Design an enzyme around this catalytic site. Structure first.
Site, mmCIF file in Angstrom:
data_model
loop_
_atom_site.group_PDB
_atom_site.id
_atom_site.type_symbol
_atom_site.label_atom_id
_atom_site.label_comp_id
_atom_site.label_asym_id
_atom_site.label_seq_id
_atom_site.Cartn_x
_atom_site.Cartn_y
_atom_site.Cartn_z
ATOM 1 N N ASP A 101 0.820 -1.204 0.000
ATOM 2 C CA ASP A 101 0.000 0.000 0.000
ATOM 3 C C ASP A 101 0.860 1.264 0.000
ATOM 4 O O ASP A 101 1.316 1.709 1.054
ATOM 5 C CB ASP A 101 -0.901 -0.011 1.238
ATOM 6 C CG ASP A 101 -1.822 1.195 1.317
ATOM 7 O OD1 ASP A 101 -1.940 1.916 0.310
ATOM 8 O OD2 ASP A 101 -2.441 1.405 2.392
ATOM 9 N N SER B 22 -0.491 15.560 -12.152
ATOM 10 C CA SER B 22 -0.713 15.178 -13.535
ATOM 11 C C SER B 22 -0.951 16.433 -14.370
ATOM 12 O O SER B 22 -1.477 17.438 -13.889
ATOM 13 C CB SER B 22 -1.903 14.221 -13.627
ATOM 14 O OG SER B 22 -2.276 13.999 -14.973
#
Length: 330
Positions: free
Chosen positions: A35, A199
């Site tokens: 994770d 992004s």
């Protein structure tokens, strides 16, 4: 040193991935959920409340000759999906795919929430976010990657998740055969303890690319792609019959519908998530309504590039003094 381990989807939908981890001496092998959105290595154990264990493999510290109680230490964590667990702490030898850390904090669960009990395939979590998020008190503990880092050939690990198939976590090296083209690296902020990056935009199917900054985290422990409501609306508007369902808890669509791809920007580069990756199957057995793999982050407080996005790429988690993220197509 290096390590390399195969990671395997827990079910036919890629709801999560499990990776075998050796703990203790002799080895006890548990299947852990790696994770990159948290920083605790915790396991179902001989100490876990009996009524809360249902099929998981447990770590029994008393059977490990290298286990040592971390005296006075406790831990307690709550995850974004509402799940939680807590307990005490041992140090022990932990190996992943041939890479061994001695003295790793192994957080033994005394209590786990229902969603963990109900998932027989996940024996615990191995956190790979920054150690500043680790919940051990009074002395915060280091992640497996942090402990291994100085010994690794290069201070990196990579995630190469499969679509409806196994993939690979590598530590200490970049497998140049595992991706096409080049790896585009992008800046990381560690201020919130995550692999947080920005992004450069998105496209829906064959549509034109929208240049826009989207801050989010690279999170192998989250199943879906969670993005701003504007972006998500633009995606599902291209799917015949799709709608946001409050009763189901997100966007659903008829499985007779064809899903467009979704492209996200990494610098000037582009990662294309095929339409098929965005199908998470019937909302309930036999239903003609399918659950979508791109969902709104509104109310989470952060955008999450979860498995839906990451499995479309070869992803480098670069733990150099100034951390960065790399993405390649594959």
């Amino acid at each position: 040193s290096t390590g390399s381990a195969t990671t395997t989807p827990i079910d036919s939908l890629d709801d999560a991935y499990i990776t075998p981890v050796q703990i203790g001496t002799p080895a006890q092998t548990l299947n852990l959920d790696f994770d990159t959105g948290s920083s605790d290595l915790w396991v179902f154990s001989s100490e876990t409340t009996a009524s809360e264990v249902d099929g998981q493999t447990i770590y029994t510290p008393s059977k490990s000759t290298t286990a040592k109680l971390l005296s006075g230490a406790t831990w307690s964590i709550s995850y974004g999906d509402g799940s939680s667990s807590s307990g005490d702490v041992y140090t022990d030898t932990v190996s992943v795919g041939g890479l061994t850390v001695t003295g790793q904090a192994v957080e033994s669960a005394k209590k786990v929430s229902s969603s963990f009990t109900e998932d027989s395939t996940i024996d615990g979590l191995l956190g790979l976010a920054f150690s500043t998020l680790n919940t051990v008190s009074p002395t915060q503990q280091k992640t497996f990657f942090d402990n291994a880092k100085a010994s690794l050939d290069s201070p990196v690990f990579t995630a190469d998740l499969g679509y409806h198939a196994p993939g690979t976590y590598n530590f200490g090296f970049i497998d140049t055969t595992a991706y096409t083209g080049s790896i585009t690296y992008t800046a990381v902020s560690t201020k919130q303890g995550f692999w947080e990056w920005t992004s450069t935009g998105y496209a829906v199917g064959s549509g034109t690319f929208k240049s826009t900054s989207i801050d989010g985290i690279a999170d192998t422990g989250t199943t879906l792609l969670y993005l701003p409501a504007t972006v998500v609306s633009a995606y599902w508007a291209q799917v015949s019959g799709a709608k946001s369902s409050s009763s189901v808890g997100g966007y659903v669509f008829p499985c007779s519908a064809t899903l467009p791809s979704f492209t996200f920007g990494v610098g000037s580069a582009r990662i294309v998530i095929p339409g098929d990756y965005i199908d998470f199957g019937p909302i309930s057995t036999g239903s003609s309504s399918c659950f979508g793999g791109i969902q709104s982050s509104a109310g989470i407080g952060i955008n999450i590039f979860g498995d839906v996005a990451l499995k479309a790429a070869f992803v480098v988690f670069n733990g150099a003094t100034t951390p960065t993220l790399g993405f390649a197509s594959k």
